[PDB]
């Protein structure tokens, strides 16, 4: 008696919510507080005049390269100009909700906790509903806090509410995508890859559309957030387009969960091979075999993104400025790639598969430098390929490809020390405090925040030196000293050698 | 009759997991469940809990289909997995009483006696357990609940010959007071001295089932 | 002529005294049993032997060298079967055998096929579909079919039906014939009598009794 498929949802929600009580408040505050205190606040000092904002609004609609990244500007009002750079939060919130949903649904279910939970009196959809409730609540909280903060400023009141609801809707559209994608494969990494491919496609379509006519910006969940048009005449009804989609997606997710056999996905497995080829006989070969798909996917994605940022660039004092800013994002994404490749060491050790390997003819360095070498090589290859693609596209759309290609390749390659520094940090953490290895992500996020909110908030030029992305030189003409590159490489080497020397004297438990 | 499997079948891919099984457990008796290392035992146990979806046949658990009544019948069933995995951060006592709260019932007088008899140390983070004290957590959390049907998968795995004897004694006491057990053993020293009317499955289909 | 020789081993895990003066000695060609209650120090000793843990005292002479400093030249003659077997979920069952045996002494193609035939494994199936009994045959076949003069088996028959745990006993009896030292840590007091002589019992880190059966 009294049994529904949702029984036990509240308890699962309350033990998911206590699993992450340090991450959720931090990333909910980080995407909501610096809207009325940084972005809107620093428009009365950079553009402190009614006629000064007109020139800035004219210099945005007359340059496709700049409005590919951020979106168009529809008037010279204070709210529209100030919030223009804040149109990047719609992608960060999507990343956050995707990661949270996958982490709570597929990450633990793959580790063997689904059998422990479902054998109890919990319902069938208790786990999915718990995770969706958590993510929807977070995406409401961030939008509500942002709107409440913006309502305390001199901007129009309607636009603040419009932006808050737009942020919440963009957070909700991709939670459903993550829920649908978590029902596909019995591997968490593949589900994350499928979920993030959709977000990458949406961003690429948004950029291509908004750098031109704009009619292609209606075909991507991002874009339905920019056409709400806060502070420029609100299109309220477009919110329905972002609300009628989630309800269609979510009702599909539950359906995929209906008959699915906890532990599986959609396609049954296939037999492999009975013998190991003469390549899988070493830690290097095993490490490469585990990381083929990730490297291929990341390389293809970064190439496709570079092929667009190098084409919208030219429809020399602004071309260099934009090509030095479109590659910092690629540097950050490649740093995330490096960290995700390096954490496979901690994943192996916590899974009791390090002992099986180190109880053989493998030293605690021929094993470390089998994931570390892959992390340092895959990121470099991806960044260089993206740079070549962008340079080729830019040269082709100008007319000559033999002149600009070396400059763009150099601009892409000078990001490498700041990409390897994150692998260095992770390896240094794995060898002193192995349990505290997954905080490397936090460090990365910190750096990103300090890059975005740092200069605008007016921090002194000594707290802004604590990030590596601000020290990278400029390739082209002057402004190239190559001194920060040597310092960054030395720091990477020091961190890596300390992490490696602290692993050789430790207990593998 | 708590169990009435009468022709169950399951195919995962092309792998013939299960090809017609004929289990039948009655009220208040221990019932062995034997077979080789591919027979389809753990799959049958999962199917009875509504966690694998049978692709044919008729399954009947405590009077209702396992798949649709999976939330309602779990108030009378305790499950001990073959591969025991616990939350790393929680403690032994925290795990036991969390699983009790989730199932909505415990017996503290029996729980304390079980902890003192199995020799478990309830205050250690779950990751610091020697896998024999990690099977004891599941044993304590299952034998101390109000369930009236135990689906023990392979309970005495990693237990020294003393805790194994204690486990046999606890199962005897449990069977004395109305609990019904379906036990998969692979150890023919506990099956002989514990249960009767065993059932043997070879490739998915029963080959010999009857009184010991 | 003495593969293992431990004298006065000790190891603290913080406030826990795991080992308090263990004594052990194997004699180059004997199957040595290693019994003890739960929480006695039967793995911790095996993990100290392989160089995965640093001892807090005493002396250890595995095959004639320090287990911690010479932990590479000695592991070309040692086969290890973990207490809880864990495999890679994407590699096939037949690839894990070759991968594991290609870091130790090296696989023996004459015995690999024979062991796959007499254990009845299926070497073309992803390793996340193995039923806890074919997940142990992978480790057993990879360890028995190698060039190793010392086997550190740790509860080797966990999850094996009453016929495969007789095939395993026959395989150990046949492997001991060609001079292969074995250290068998087990809880089933039915295989130790059939295989092992000169057993050693530990209780709380200290050996309590030792000698032949
Ligand atoms: C049609 C024509 C055009 C076609 C164009 C085609 C375009 C390309 C298509 C192809 C696709 C290309 C891209 C593929 C990406 C694949 C990514 C993937 O699989 O995941 C990688 C990886 C996770 O991989 P994994 O191996 O499963 O991770 C193991 C973890 O241990 C698992 O950890 P866990 O789940 O247990 O929990 C850990 C989690 C904890 O979970 C949480 O609580 C989430 C917290 C999130 C915080 C919010 C982050 C917001 C960013 C900073 C904002 C500061 C202000 O912590 C994190 O994950 C933190 C992530 C930090 C990300 C750093 C920021 C990167 C973006 C920067 C943008 C530039 C500015 O995640 C990321 O890298 C995220 C960034 C993704 C970048 C692409 C975004 C688009
Ligand atoms: C430049 C900044 C560079 C440094 C950034 C440091 C980030 C620390 C937070 C990391 C974290 O919570 O875990 C990461 C978390 C890893 O979670 P996990 O995979 O469950 O594993 C966690 C443990 O390893 C698994 O450990 P367990 O669960 O076994 O043990 C539990 C343990 C878990 O302990 C922790 O996870 C926290 C340990 C903190 C150590 C680092 C402190 C650095 C202080 C600087 O609990 C504790 O130890 C209690 C901690 C008490 C509260 C700590 C409050 C931290 C305040 C952070 C101040 C900076 C903001 O993944 C994430 O990345 C979450 C998303 C990102 C959240 C934070 C994003 C922003 C942070 C920086 C913002 C700074 C301001 C930016 C400029 C603003 C301009 C206007
Ligand atoms: N998730 C799965 N996907 C595909 N095939 C599977 C899956 N789980 C098990 N199998 C296969 O289907 C059959 C079911 O095995 P099952 O788990 O029933 O074995 P078992 O009897 O429990 O083994 P043991 O008795 O040693 O515990 C086996 O052939 C197994 O390899
Ligand atoms: N990482 C660890 N942290 C704390 N205690 C540990 C750790 N590893 C082992 N121990 C302790 O070592 C002792 C023996 O462990 P083990 O050798 O696995 O036991 P057994 O003899 O049952 O095989 C136990 O007291 C156990 O708790
Ligand atoms: O805790 V034990 O390694 O004796 O199963
Ligand atoms: Mg089983
Ligand atoms: Mg052990």
**DSSP H or E run through A55:** helix A52-61
Tokens of A322: 């934009």
Q: SS3 breakdown of chain B: % helix, strand, coil, rounded to 5?
A: 35, 20, 50
Cβ(A334)–Cβ(A419) under 8 Å? yes
Same domain for A461 and A361, yes or no, is yes
> Which alpha helices (H) appear in chain C, and where do they start and end?
42-49, 93-101, 109-119, 134-144, 164-175, 191-195
* Residues of the domain holding A418: 281-509
Tokens of B88: 């790393």
In a domain? residue A170? yes
Burial code (b: 16+ CB inside 10 Å, e: under 16) for A477-497 equals eeeeeeebbeebeebbeebbe
Q: Best mutation site among C13, C14, C38, C165 for testing chain B: the one with the most B CBs within 10 Å?
A: C38
Burial code (b: 16+ CB inside 10 Å, e: under 16) for A245-257 equals bbeebbeebbebb
Superfamily name and number for C1-78+149-161+176-213: P-loop containing nucleotide triphosphate hydrolases (3.40.50.300)
The contacts of residue A387 (CB under 8 Å, 6+ apart) are A306, A327, A408, A409, A411, A412, A413
Cβ(C83)–Cβ(C155) under 8 Å? yes
Under an 8 A CB cutoff, do C75 and A274 touch? Answer: no
Same domain for A238 and A294, yes or no, is no
CA atoms within 13 A on the CB side of A277: 7
**DSSP H or E run through C183:** strand C181-184
Q: Which residues are paired to B201 by β-bridges? A: B206
Spatial CA neighbour of C140 closest among C78, C82, C89: C82
CA atoms within 13 A on the CB side of B43: 28
**Residue A294, number of CB atoms within 10 A of its CB:** 18
Cβ(C142)–Cβ(C100) under 8 Å? yes
Domain ranges of chain C: 1-78+149-161+176-213, 87-147
Instruction: List Cα–Cα distances, A205 to A222, A269, A330, in angstroms.
Output: 9, 34, 17
Rounded Cα gap, residues A324 and A472, in angstroms: 10
A-chain residues within 8 Å CB-CB of B46?
115
Is A213 buried (19+), middle (13-18) or exposed (0-12) by CB count in 10 A? Answer: exposed
Spatial CA neighbour of A66 closest among A321, A295, A237: A321
In a domain? residue A276? no
Spatial CA neighbour of B8 closest among B62, B66, B63: B66
Structure obtained using: cryo-EM
The 8-class DSSP code of residue C126 comes to B
Resolution in angstroms comes to 3.4
| Dihedral pair phi/psi, residue A88, rounded to 5° | -90, -15
Same domain for A350 and A209, yes or no, is no
Q: Is A312 left (phi over 0), alpha (psi -120 to 50) or beta?
A: alpha
Residues in chain A preceding a C-to-N separation beyond 2.5 angstroms (breaks): 315
In a domain? residue A275? no
Rounded Cα gap, residues A166 and B185, in angstroms: 58
Spatial CA neighbour of C170 closest among C187, C140, C195, C143: C195
Over its C-alpha atoms, chain B yields an Rg (Å, rounded) of: 17
Q: Ligand 2 pocket, A28 CB below 6 A? A: no
- CA B100: distance to chain centroid? 16
Is A49 buried (19+), middle (13-18) or exposed (0-12) by CB count in 10 A? Answer: exposed
Could you tell me the strand order of the sheet in which C5-12 lies?
A: C17-25, C5-12, C59-60
Spatial CA neighbour of C156 closest among C205, C191, C107, C204: C191
Between helices A368-398 and A404-413, what is the axis angle to 10°?
150
Rounded Cα gap, residues B6 and A438, in angstroms: 50
Tokens of C26: 């194997």
Tokens of C3: 């593969």
Is A144 buried (19+), middle (13-18) or exposed (0-12) by CB count in 10 A? Answer: middle
Chains touching C, CB cut-off 8 Å, 3+ pairs: A, B
In a domain? residue A23? yes
Q: Which residues are paired to B10 by β-bridges? A: B18
| Dihedral pair phi/psi, residue B78, rounded to 5° | -120, 135
Same domain for A353 and A243, yes or no, is no
Residue indicated by tokens 């502070």: A231
Is C166 buried (19+), middle (13-18) or exposed (0-12) by CB count in 10 A? Answer: middle
Is A436 buried (19+), middle (13-18) or exposed (0-12) by CB count in 10 A? Answer: exposed
End position of a domain, from candidates A264, A296, A323: A264
Spatial CA neighbour of C50 closest among C139, C155, C153: C153
The contacts of residue C111 (CB under 8 Å, 6+ apart) are C144, C145
The contacts of residue A419 (CB under 8 Å, 6+ apart) are A331, A334, A335, A338, A379, A380, A383
Rounded Cα gap, residues A161 and A154, in angstroms: 14
Q: How far apart are the first and last CA of chain C?
A: 22
Same domain for A211 and A305, yes or no, is no
Instruction: List Cα–Cα distances, A140 to A136, A430, A485, in angstroms.
Output: 6, 36, 42
Rounded Cα gap, residues B156 and C201, in angstroms: 21
- CA A270: distance to chain centroid? 32
Q: Is C43 annotated as a binding residue?
A: yes
Q: Which residues are paired to B176 by β-bridges? A: none
Cβ(A39)–Cβ(A82) under 8 Å? yes
Cβ(A179)–Cβ(A103) under 8 Å? no
Maximum CA extent, chain C: 49
Under an 8 A CB cutoff, do B75 and A122 touch? Answer: no
Q: Is C3 annotated as a binding residue?
A: no
Rounded Cα gap, residues A504 and A369, in angstroms: 13
End position of a domain, from candidates A264, A296, A326: A264
Cβ(A96)–Cβ(A126) under 8 Å? no
Question: What number of H helices and E strands is found in chain C?
Answer: 6, 9
SS3 A189: helix
Instruction: List Cα–Cα distances, A335 to A305, A338, A353, A425, A491, in angstroms.
Output: 16, 5, 26, 11, 16
A-chain residues within 8 Å CB-CB of C87?
353
Cβ(B71)–Cβ(A124) under 8 Å? yes
In a domain? residue A490? yes
Atom number in ligand 1 closest to CA A452: 55
Q: SS3 breakdown of chain C: % helix, strand, coil, rounded to 5?
A: 30, 25, 50
SS3 C24: strand
Report residues near ion ligand 7: CB below 5 Å.
Answer: C 43, 83
Same domain for A291 and A258, yes or no, is no
Rounded Cα gap, residues C184 and C16, in angstroms: 25
Q: How far apart are the first and last CA of chain A?
A: 47
Spatial CA neighbour of B33 closest among B82, B70, B87, B84: B82
**Tally of residues, chain B:** 212
Residue indicated by tokens 């763009």: A408
Chain A residue with minimum CA distance to C54: A507
Burial code (b: 16+ CB inside 10 Å, e: under 16) for A374-386 equals bbbebbbebbbbb
End position of a domain, from candidates A236, A264, A292: A264
Under an 8 A CB cutoff, do B38 and C134 touch? Answer: yes
Q: Is B41 annotated as a binding residue?
A: yes
| Dihedral pair phi/psi, residue C72, rounded to 5° | -125, -45
Same domain for A165 and A287, yes or no, is no
SS3 B69: coil
Domain count, chain A: 2
Rounded Cα gap, residues B17 and B13, in angstroms: 9
In a domain? residue A269? no
Cβ(C131)–Cβ(B38) under 8 Å? yes
B-chain residues within 8 Å CB-CB of C83?
131
A277 CA from centroid of ligand 4 (Å): 38
In a domain? residue A270? no
């Amino acid at each position: 008696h009294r049994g529904s498929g949702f029984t036990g949802t509240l308890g699962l929600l309350r033990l998911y919510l206590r699993r992450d009580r340090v991450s959720l408040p931090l990333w909910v505050l980080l995407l909501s507080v610096p809207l009325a205190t940084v972005y809107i606040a620093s428009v009365e000092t950079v553009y402190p005049d009614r006629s000064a904002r007109a020139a800035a609004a004219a210099a945005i609609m007359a340059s496709p390269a700049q409005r590919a990244l951020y979106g168009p500007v529809y008037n010279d009002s204070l709210g529209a100009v100030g919030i223009w750079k804040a149109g990047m939060f719609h992608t960060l919130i999507a990343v956050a909700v995707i990661l949270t949903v996958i982490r709570h649904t597929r990450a633990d279910e793959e580790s063997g906790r689904a059998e422990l939970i479902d054998s109890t009196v919990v319902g069938r959809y208790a786990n999915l509903t718990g995770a969706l409730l958590l993510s929807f609540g977070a995406s409401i909280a961030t939008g509500a806090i942002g709107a409440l903060g913006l309502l305390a400023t001199d901007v129009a009141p309607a636009g603040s509410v419009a932006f808050g609801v737009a942020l919440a809707a963009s957070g909700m559209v991709f939670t459903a995508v993550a829920a649908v994608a978590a029902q596909l494969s019995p591997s968490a990494r593949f589900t994350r890859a499928v979920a993030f491919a959709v977000l990458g496609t949406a961003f690429a379509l948004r950029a291509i559309g908004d750098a031109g006519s704009g009619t292609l910006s209606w075909c991507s969940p991002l874009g339905w957030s920019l056409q709400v048009r806060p502070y420029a005449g609100e299109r309220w009804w477009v919110l329905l387009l972002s609300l009628a989609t989630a309800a269609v997606l979510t009702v599909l997710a539950y359906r995929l969960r209906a008959g699915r056999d906890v532990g599986a996905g959609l396609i049954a497995e296939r037999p492999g091979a009975g013998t190991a080829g003469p390549m899988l006989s070493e830690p290097f070969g095993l490490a490469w075999r585990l990381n083929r798909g990730s490297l291929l996917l990341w390389t293809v994605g970064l190439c496709l993104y570079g092929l667009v940022m190098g084409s919208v660039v030219h429809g020399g004092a602004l071309e260099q400025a934009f090509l030095a800013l479109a590659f910092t994002m690629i540097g950050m994404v490649a740093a995330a790639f490096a960290v995700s490749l390096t954490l496979r060491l901690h994943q192996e050790e916590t899974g009791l598969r390090a002992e099986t390997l180190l109880a053989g003819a493998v030293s605690r360095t021929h094993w470390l430098a089998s994931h570390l070498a892959m992390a340092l090589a895959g990121s470099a290859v991806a960044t260089l390929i993206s740079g070549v693609a962008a340079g080729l596209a830019y040269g082709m759309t100008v007319g000559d490809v033999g002149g600009k290609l070396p400059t763009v390749v150099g601009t892409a390659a000078v990001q490498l020390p700041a990409v390897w520094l994150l692998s260095a940090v992770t390896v240094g953490l794995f060898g002193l405090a192995p349990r505290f290895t997954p905080v490397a992500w936090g460090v990365l996020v910190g750096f990103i925040a300090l890059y975005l909110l740092g200069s605008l908030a007016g921090f002194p030029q000594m707290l802004l030196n604590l990030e590596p992305f601000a020290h990278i030189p400029r390739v082209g003409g002057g402004d190239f000293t190559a001194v920060p590159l040597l310092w960054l490489l030395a720091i990477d080497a020091a961190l890596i050698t300390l992490g490696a020397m602290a692993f050789r004297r430790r207990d593998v438990r | 009759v708590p169990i009435e499997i009468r022709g169950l079948t399951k195919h995962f891919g092309s792998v013939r997991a299960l090809d017609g099984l004929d289990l039948t457990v009655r009220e208040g008796e221990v019932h062995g469940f034997l077979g080789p290392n591919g027979a389809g035992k753990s799959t049958t146990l999962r199917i009875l809990l509504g966690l694998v979806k049978a692709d044919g046949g008729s399954v009947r658990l405590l009077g209702g289909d396992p798949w649709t009544d999976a939330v309602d019948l779990h108030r009378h069933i305790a499950y001990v997995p073959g591969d025991v995995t616990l939350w790393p951060s929680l403690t032994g006592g925290e795990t036991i009483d969390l699983l009790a709260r989730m199932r909505g019932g415990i017996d503290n007088a029996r729980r304390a006696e079980l902890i003192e008899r199995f020799g478990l140390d309830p205050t250690k983070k779950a990751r610091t357990y020697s896998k024999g004290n990690r099977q004891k957590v599941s044993l304590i959390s299952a034998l101390s609940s109000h369930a009236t049907l135990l689906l023990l998968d392979e309970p005495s795995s990693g237990l020294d010959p003393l805790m194994e004897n204690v486990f046999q004694q606890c199962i005897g006491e449990a069977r004395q007071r109305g609990v019904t057990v379906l036990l998969s053993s692979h150890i023919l020293a506990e099956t002989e001295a514990l249960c009767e009317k065993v059932t043997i499955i070879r490739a998915g289909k029963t080959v010999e089932s009857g009184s010991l």
